[PDB]
């Protein structure tokens, strides 16, 4: 009923990367939005950015440098996909480590995971720099956030201890 809202919040796990989750969430979600962990300049150096920059491809890079150009910094941008089955992306800018309130604004940065119209997600384990660290903050900052919605959530992370951490959280 992949297309219909869930009855209730549904999590898929992967531990792999964007390219596995992104054959899985193919597979088993068939639609779904791909939570990118940005900056707000969008830029895609690096990490889950430069996977998702290169997978989508020029048009999804183009719309994203001409948007920051015209409209400046962006903490939250929804953009086309431009891949077949990919809904959208949401470029997610999440907080950083020591940041005031890490908590609040973990919370805050998965509340804006969500997409108005759209059911299924992947969403990658916000990082607050070094991998690994504070993924159990991240993760329970996700369960928060998402608590009562009915969506689907495929979490990924290259970690199987982050993804064991969800596993053993799970109520």
Not at 9 to 21: A, F, I, P, S
Not at 40 to 68: N, P, Q, R, W
Not at 97 to 113: F, R, S, T, W
Not at 137 to 151: L, N, P, Q, V
């Amino acid at each position: 009923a992949t297309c219909e809202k869930p009855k209730f919040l549904e999590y898929k796990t992967c531990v792999g990367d964007l390219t596995v989750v992104i054959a899985k969430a193919l597979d088993e979600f068939k639609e779904f939005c791909i939570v990118n962990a940005a900056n707000e300049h969008m830029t895609h150096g690096s990490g889950v950015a430069k996977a998702i920059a290169d997978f989508c491809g020029l048009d999804f890079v183009e719309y994203c440098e001409d948007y920051v150009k015209k409209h400046g910094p962006q903490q939250r941008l929804v953009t086309p996909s431009f891949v077949k089955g990919i809904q959208c992306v949401n470029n997610v800018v999440g907080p950083r480590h020591g940041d005031n309130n890490l908590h609040e604004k973990l919370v805050a940065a998965y509340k804006n995971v969500l997409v108005d119209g759209v059911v299924n997600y992947v969403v990658p384990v916000l990082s607050l720099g070094i991998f690994g660290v504070d993924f159990k903050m991240s993760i329970d900052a996700m369960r928060e956030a998402f608590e009562g919605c009915t969506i689907r959530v495929l979490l990924f992370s290259l970690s199987q201890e982050h993804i064991d951490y969800f596993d053993v959280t799970c109520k």
